[PDB]
Amino acid sequence: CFEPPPATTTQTGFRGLSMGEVLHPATVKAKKERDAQYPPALAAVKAEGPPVSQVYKNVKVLGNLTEAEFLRTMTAITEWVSPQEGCTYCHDENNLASEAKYPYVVARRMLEMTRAINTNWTQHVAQTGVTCYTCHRGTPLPPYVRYLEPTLPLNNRETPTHVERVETRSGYVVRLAKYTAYSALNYDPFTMFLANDKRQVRVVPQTALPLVGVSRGKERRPLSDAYATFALMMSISDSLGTNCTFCHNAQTFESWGKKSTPQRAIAWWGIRMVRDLNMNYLAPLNASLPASRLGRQGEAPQADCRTCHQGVTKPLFGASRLKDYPELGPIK
């Protein structure tokens, strides 16, 4: 029912606006130990040697790396994605140049995706960047993924009840609710706003008065749009383990400048980056994945803000392996 004091509070607005984070120190810690599990960077290796495009047979992405650097990349990959299963999870045990198992072809596209994130999205990921670990956390299937309908629990390493299961229609509202910070908001903000770029998040007018020609009748955006945008924000808030005042001055949610924080602009690239991963990298993987991984509409698992952030404003508290593994990005 309740959480014992003290609380940990910061300030993001002008004194006396009640803007800032509210954190429970023990929870902040329960996350910190879980994000610390991050495997340390494998010791740097011999730079000299022939490229693996010549050395090996079936290298379509990492060809400009020397063999010594190439196997270090593979080991690192193995730590982050399938450390229980070892190399054999993607590879034919006898033939390492064969594409028999699907995690191989999927991993090459993942390799291409991870390099895209670090290279074409520094507006969001900055110098921290991402690795295979940011999402996977040591399992082939990342803990937090999204289908074209809400599913439970949010952590797919946990067993759902019959009610929590997607076949059971009677838990739909609850499935919906837990994705929107326990609200009754009757909108799936993932499939609406993050699954593609078809919808517009902003709903507030930027004029004091109603503009003629869009203010009456069928010319109007339905009020539902306001509900749905709110839904997305509850989801964004719960995903990063924060609140509205981290990015907005509630006085006016619509206004930038002094009324917004730098984090809001970073969040703005977040929406663009998530959309890009879903449309161009993640959703097309449905053809390459077996049905047991797919959703009820034949879709592949896609990512949201939680996938990387997992309850934290910085994924893994700004832990980076960018310099240590340069082959994963940026690419000049």
Partner 1 sequence: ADYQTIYTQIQARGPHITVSGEWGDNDRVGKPFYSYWLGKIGDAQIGPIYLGASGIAAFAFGSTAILIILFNMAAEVHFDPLQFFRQFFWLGLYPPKAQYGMGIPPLHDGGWWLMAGLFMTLSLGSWWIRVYSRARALGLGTHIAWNFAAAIFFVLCIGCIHPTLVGSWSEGVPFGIWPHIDWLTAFSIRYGNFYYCPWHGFSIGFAYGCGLLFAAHGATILAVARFGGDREIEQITDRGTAVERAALFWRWTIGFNATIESVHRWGWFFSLMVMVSASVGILLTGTFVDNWYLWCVKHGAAPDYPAYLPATPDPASLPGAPK
Partner 2 sequence: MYHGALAQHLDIAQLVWYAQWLVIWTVVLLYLRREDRREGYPLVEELPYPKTFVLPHGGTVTVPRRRPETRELKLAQTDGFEGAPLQPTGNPLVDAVGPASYAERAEVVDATVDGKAKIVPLRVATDFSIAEGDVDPRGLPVVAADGVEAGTVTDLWVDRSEHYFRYLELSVAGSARTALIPLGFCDVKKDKIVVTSILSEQFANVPRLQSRDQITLREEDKVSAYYAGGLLYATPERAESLL
Partner 3 sequence: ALLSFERKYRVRGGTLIGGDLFDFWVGPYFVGFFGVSAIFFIFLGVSLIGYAASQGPTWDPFAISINPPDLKYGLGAAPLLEGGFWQAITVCALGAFISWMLREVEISRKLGIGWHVPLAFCVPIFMFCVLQVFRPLLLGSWGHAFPYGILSHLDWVNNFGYQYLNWHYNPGHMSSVSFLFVNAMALGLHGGLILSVANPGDGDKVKTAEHENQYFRDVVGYSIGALSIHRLGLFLASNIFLTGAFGTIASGPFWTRGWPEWWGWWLDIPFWS
Residues making up the binding site for heme: 74, 87, 90-91, 110, 124, 132, 135-136, 233, 244, 247-248, 305, 308-309
How near is the Cβ of 31 to ligand HEC at its closest, in Å? 14
> Is 263 an interacting residue with respect to ligand HEC (CB under 6 A)?
yes
> Is 11 an interacting residue with respect to partner 3 (CB under 8 A)?
yes
How near is the Cβ of 222 to partner 2 at its closest, in Å? 18
Can you tell me which of 18, 161, 251, 280 binds partner 1, judged by CB under 8 A?
251
> Is 57 an interacting residue with respect to ligand HEC (CB under 6 A)?
yes
Can you tell me which of 32, 57, 258, 314 binds partner 1, judged by CB under 8 A?
258
Tell me the C-alpha distance between 329 and 218, whole Å: 48
φ, ψ of residue 145 in degrees (nearest 5): -125, 170
- Contacted entry of partner 3, partner 2, ligand HEC, none for residue 202, CB cut-off 5 to 8 Å set by kind: ligand HEC
Give the tokens for residue 43. Answer: 């010791």
> Is 317 an interacting residue with respect to ligand HEC (CB under 6 A)?
no
Biggest alpha carbon–alpha carbon distance for the chain:
71
Tell me the C-alpha distance between 294 and 290, whole Å: 7
**In the window 161-180, what residues touch partner 1 (CB under 8 A)?**
163, 169-174, 177
Can you tell me which of 105, 126, 148, 244 binds partner 3, judged by CB under 8 A?
244
Of residues 3 and 48, the one with the C-beta less far from partner 3:
3
CB 316 within 8 A of CB 301: no
- Contacted entry of partner 1, partner 3, ligand HEC, none for residue 61, CB cut-off 5 to 8 Å set by kind: ligand HEC
Give the tokens for residue 222. Answer: 């339905």
User: How many residues in total does the chain contain?
Assistant: 332
Count other Cβ atoms within 10 Å, centred on residue 79.
18
Best CA proximity match to 3, nearest among 17, 18, 23: 23
**In the window 45-104, what residues touch partner 3 (CB under 8 A)?**
none
H/E stretch holding 23: strand 22-23
Can you tell me which of 39, 104, 199, 294 binds ligand HEC, judged by CB under 6 A?
104
How near is the Cβ of 291 to partner 3 at its closest, in Å? 28
For the annotated binding site, the residues are: 74, 87, 90-91, 110, 124, 132, 135-136, 233, 244, 247-248, 305, 308-309
> Is 228 an interacting residue with respect to ligand HEC (CB under 6 A)?
no
- Contacted entry of ligand HEC, partner 3, partner 2, none for residue 6, CB cut-off 5 to 8 Å set by kind: partner 3
**In the window 196-225, what residues touch partner 2 (CB under 8 A)?**
207-212, 215-216
Can you tell me which of 229, 295, 321, 325 binds ligand HEC, judged by CB under 6 A?
229
How near is the Cβ of 170 to ligand HEC at its closest, in Å? 27
DSSP state of 8: E
Best CA proximity match to 140, nearest among 195, 81, 99: 81
CB 255 within 8 A of CB 33: no
H/E stretch holding 117: helix 102-120
Burial of 150 (0-12, 13-18, 19+ CB in 10 A): buried
Tell me the C-alpha distance between 90 and 94, whole Å: 12
Name, in order, each residue with C-beta under 8 angstroms of 15's C-beta and a sequence gap of 6 or more: none
Interface residues toward partner 2, by CB under 8 A: 207-212, 215-216
